[PDB]
Amino acid sequence: PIVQNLQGQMVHQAISPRTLNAWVKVVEEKAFSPEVIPMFSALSEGATPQDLNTMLNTVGGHQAAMQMLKETINEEAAEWDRLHPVHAGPIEPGQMREPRGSDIAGTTSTLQEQIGWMTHNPPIPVGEIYKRWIILGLNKIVRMYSPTSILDIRQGPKEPFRDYVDRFYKTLRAEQASQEVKNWMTETLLVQNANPDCKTILKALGPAATLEEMMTACQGVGGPGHKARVL
Amino acid sequence: PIVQNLQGQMVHQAISPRTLNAWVKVVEEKAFSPEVIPMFSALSEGATPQDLNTMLNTVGGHQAAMQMLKETINEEAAEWDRLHPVHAGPIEPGQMREPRGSDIAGTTSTLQEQIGWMTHNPPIPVGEIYKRWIILGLNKIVRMYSPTSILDIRQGPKEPFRDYVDRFYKTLRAEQASQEVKNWMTETLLVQNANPDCKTILKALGPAATLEEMMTACQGVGGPGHKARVL
Amino acid sequence: PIVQNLQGQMVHQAISPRTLNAWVKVVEEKAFSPEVIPMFSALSEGATPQDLNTMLNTVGGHQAAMQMLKETINEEAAEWDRLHPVHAGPIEPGQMREPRGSDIAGTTSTLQEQIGWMTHNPPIPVGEIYKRWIILGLNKIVRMYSPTSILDIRQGPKEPFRDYVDRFYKTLRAEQASQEVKNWMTETLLVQNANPDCKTILKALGPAATLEEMMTACQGVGGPGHKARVL
Amino acid sequence: PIVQNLQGQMVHQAISPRTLNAWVKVVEEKAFSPEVIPMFSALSEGATPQDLNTMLNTVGGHQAAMQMLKETINEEAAEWDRLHPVHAGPIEPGQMREPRGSDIAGTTSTLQEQIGWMTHNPPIPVGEIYKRWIILGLNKIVRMYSPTSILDIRQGPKEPFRDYVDRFYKTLRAEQASQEVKNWMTETLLVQNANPDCKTILKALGPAATLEEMMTACQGVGGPGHKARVL
Amino acid sequence: QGPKEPFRDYVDRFYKTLRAEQASQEVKNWMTETLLVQNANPDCKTILKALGPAATLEEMMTACQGVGGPGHKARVL
Incomplete structure (x- = not known):
């Protein structure tokens, strides 16, 4: 990984054992679940395509989701090279070359190029590109492997509005x-699937109360009622 | 996080995975109890808005306190822009831009800007303002979930007053x-509620009563804590 | 291992129990399975021959596969000294210490002579070179595997289709x-992990179809879960 | 231990009490075994004779075998003195005194001499030399349970042979x-212990047996007709 | 291979x-050294596993002749 670009004076750092330990043990205990994604960005700070390939390629299992992931980075790679026309005649010898789709993916490009790009003035965002591409991959995974559809999440008859809201x-x-969409769902879908004891009172709150009005609501019906949260 | 340098101004470096794990450790062990703030603070020491953001996005439980905390930091940002004038007039050639409320949260601002405020003399205190905003959220959420009012808080009839302070x-x-108000509760409601043996000594020594003398008292009224505390 | 590997101003750091405890947790969890090679290259970053041998001596199981690892190291050393021949009597410009295979393996070398190669300009990176022989050996362990069929594919009402593909x-x-062959098996048997009706649907998408299209598909006639109401 | 100085010859750093404890916890609390040896090697990066001694004397577990190693290092010292006759009384002006076996063990040598000879040119690596004696002594402690040879290794009648090889x-x-003895063993003693229908592959392999050939041997060797060459 | 069918008829x-x-x-070579003898008649596995099932095509059709039917019918193409 390479860090210190903001204000210049960048330092290359070697790949760390403890990053690939952290990365493996999270994805093993939690699976490719929504709480991986900002953890994966954080672990990926300042990472080369090769630093990224090392992490990716030490995952182990989940070869359905990895192979879905791999296919997706390949679409973006094949997209890239056709939204970048190839240079007119000779490229000057002192000029640094442009990264292709397979170089972003780290398939055709070695670490010595990647560092040169990331230590260039100002730097080539080659790694940012591989991480957004991986993240479309991770994002697609979490869609395919859905725990339940948000559309059909409803409160029980005697389940409480706070338990529902969790x-x-x-x-x-x-x-x-x-x-x-997700500002919609808190505005709208939250009420229309809420249970009938609570739902009369949520249309008294209407579609732009404060979150504290939604929180104060619904202790007189559902679950162990008014005492439950204060005893 | 921004870190101390001898060769010039403070240099930015990445988040430690051990810090992100220590964060998730402390959230797991303390559950947003108000002892979190010392450990939030100590993990938050050199921390950018990008670091503070990362702390906020890696919290997997605690749905309501997390939303309420988000509502608080966004509200501080919107008050801040109303509070500080925009200034429409030109800025000197190469002058760093003034930090807006959105810029403090890092929604209009990127880490290159964020380090650039940081490395002025004295700092513009962009993450220290942000971290104070978060700290008010945590405290309101403590108070949000408090089980009975201070002016309603009583000892059981079978209690030796021993643990009424907790x-x-x-x-x-x-x-x-x-x-x-505390003195008024202490002269009126406290004496009225307080255990017989303790209540004699609390009337005798007025609303500024010695805490230890009650606690020494109450050895023979029975039940939970009447035998002495020990270290 | 060394700080700033082939970069100047180069500082040796001792072999940390963090790096050996991670090398231990990898062999215990998943042995010599192919995904360790990126972990193993990260572990081997900056590493001297002496660090690599300490890594190998830690393995106390699998001795027959490890003697083969060892044999393969002895064969690779022997090739290195037949491609670069060993000298008889004193060196003609005087001894500069050119790394022979036995030196590569840390057998006839000092720690100064190993480092010396890393601090010489152009460098001879002996660790990367010894590392390649060890990776050849660990790949050759996986070829000593107990028979597993690649034509015997399954797809019945026991695992999801994703899980068959996994x-x-x-x-x-x-x-x-x-x-x-491995592409060939993939084009030939990708669809063959589904049930007969899912396969008819899978093939109806075409020969450009990908795993995200397949894993939304089989609407009402798919494997375990993931098809909604059944026809 | 001794580490690089940046402005002159090596300097001493002070021995790790945190790893010195995790050292001793794997001497005292369990039975001897081969992974004890590299945990001592890792501890011993740059270790002086005085540090080697501390590594021994903070150990309090297993005093018989510790003593047997102590006794080995005495033999090695009295051996070193019969291979390297150092004269009686004071060394010459202008050159470094030569170490005896007692000077290796730290009995007769001082910190200054210990960091002296290690940094000298020609170097006497006193602390590396002393460690190798201890590596032999430990290697005997693991063989002091059981001097197991090829006569004690047995292939149970229904045993798939794989463990025998290991x-x-x-x-x-x-x-x-x-x-x-090994040409005798791969041509006679291994073939006798092997399963009846496997004896033809292993008898053909005979006194020329190779690890790759041995590691794949015995796959589908039963059934109608003989087989004898490993695929 | 058919249950009383010749090994050369299968291999043709x-x-x-x-x-x-x-x-x-x-791909053909993986089928030749991992499919060919495996899908054959067992009585032909006896002598063509004994050669080793990935050995030359000459000794394949040289062996194995007593297994099955009589063999030798000219093709009508």
């Missing part, structure tokens, strides 16, 4: 659509 | 009541 | 047959 | 045996 | 089936 946001993390 | 202190520390 | 991928990434 | 090459690694 | 069909597949030579 499930609601837990599952809403699992859903992969855009933020207008 | 309950009394942590629901006063949530509420943040006045020393004068 | 089996199939493990089988191919453990199988060290030809890359043209 | 223990056979463990046996030859652990204490080096003669080439002639 | 097999190389016929290899001819018509558009596959690589390496």
Whole structure:
């Protein structure tokens, strides 16, 4: 990995054992689940295509999701080279070459190039590109391997609105659509699947109460009622 | 996180995986109890808005406190822009831009900018403002889940007053009541509620009563804690 | 191992129990399975021959596979000294210490002479070179595997289709047959992990179909779960 | 231990009490075994005779065998003195005194001499020389349970032979045996212990047996008609 | 191979089936050294595993003649 680009003065660091231990043991205990993705970005800080390939290729299992992941990075790679026209005549010898789709993927490109790119003035975002591409991969996985659809998450007859709300946001993390969609669901879908004892009172709150109004609601019906949360 | 340098101004380096694990350790062990803030703070020491963001995105449980905390930091950002004028007029050639409320959260600002504020003399305190905003969220969420009011907080009839301070202190520390309301509860409601043997000594020594003398008292009223505490 | 591997101003650090405890947890969990080679290359980053031998002496199981590892190291050393021949009597410009195979293996070399190669300009990177022989040996362990069929494919009401494809991928990434065969097996048997109706649907998508298209598909006629109401 | 100085000849760093404890926890709390040896080698990076001694004397477990190693290092010292006759009284002006066996063991030598000879040119590596004696002594402690040879290795009647091979090459690694005895063993004693229908492959392999040939041997060797060459 | 069918009749069909597949030579070679003798009659596994099932095509059709039917029928192409 290479860090210190912001204000210049970058340092190359070798691949760390303890990053590939952290990476393996999270994905093993939790699976490719929504809580991997900012952890994967954090572990991937300043990583080369080769630093990225080392991590990716030490995953072990889950070869359905990895092979789905691999296919997706290959689409983006094949996309890339056809949205970048090939250079007109000779490329000057002092000029640094452009990265291709297979170089971003680390398939045709060696570590010595990658460092040169990342220590160039200003730096080539080759790694940012491989990580967004991996992240489309991870994102697609979490769609395919869904725990349950957000659409059909409903409160029970005698399940409480706070217990429901824990499930609601837990599952809403699992859903992969855009933020207008997920602002919708808190606005709308939260109420329409809520249980009938609670739902009369949620249309008294209407579709732009404060989160504290939603939190204060619904202790007089559902679960062990008013005492449950204060005793 | 930004770290101390001898060769110039402080240099930015990546998050440790041991720090992200220590974070998830402390959240697991303490459950957003108000002892979190010392450990939030100590992990938050050199921390960028990108680091603080990362702390906020790696929390997997705690759905409601997490949403409520998000509502608080976004509200501080929107107050901050109303609070500070935009200034429409030109800035000197190569001058660093003024930090907006969104810039403090790192939604309009990138880590190259963030280190650039950081490495002025004295710093513009962009993550120290952000971290204070978060700290108010944690405290409101402590108070949010407090089980009975300070002005409602009582000892059982079969209690030797021994442990009435545990309950009394942590629901006063949530509420943040006045020393004068505390004196009024202590002269009125406290004496009225307090165990017989303790209540003689609390009337005798007024509302500023010696804490130890109650605690020494109450050896023969029976039940849970009447035998002495030991180290 | 050494700080700033082939980069100047180079500083030896001792072999850490963190790096050997991770080398232990890998062999215990998953032995010599192919996905350790990136972990093993990260472990071997900056490593001297002496560090590599300490890594090998730690393995106390699998001795027959380890003697083969060892034999293969002895064969590779022997090739290195037949491709680069060993000298008889004093060296003509005087002894500069050119790494022979036995020196590569840490047998007839000092730690100064190993480092010396890393601090010489152009360098001779002996560790990368010894590492390649060890990776040849660990790949050759996987070819001593107990018989596992790549034509015997399964697909019945026991695992999901994803999970059959996950089996199939493990089988191919453990199988060290030809890359043209391994693609061939993949084009021939990808669909053959589903039930008869799922296969009819799978083939109806076409010969450009990918695993994300297949794993949304089989609408109502698929494997265990993931097909909604059944027809 | 002794480490690189940046402005002159090596300097001493102070021995790790944290790893010195995790050392002793694998001497005292379990039975001797081959992975004890590299855990001592890893500890011993740059270790002086005085540090080697500490590694012995903070050990309190297994005093018989510790003593047997102590006694070995005495033999090695009295041996070193019969191979390297150092004269009586004071060394010459202008050159470094030569170490005796007592100077290797730290009995007669001081820290300054110990970091002296190690940094000298020609170097006497006193601390590497002393460690190798201890590596032999430990290697005897693991063979002091059981001097197991090829007569004690047995292939149970229904045993798939695989374990026999593993223990056979463990046996030859652990204490080096003669080439002639091994040609006798791969041509007679192994064939006699092998399963009846497997005896033709292993008898054909005979006194020329090779690890790759042995590691794949015995796959589908039963059934109608004889087989005799390993595929 | 048919249960009383000749080993050369099977192998004539097999190389016929290899001819018509558009596959690589390496693919054909994995089938020749991992499929060919495996899909044969067991009485032919007796002597053509004993050669080793990945050995030359000459000694394949030299061996194994007493297994099955009489063999030698000219093809009508």
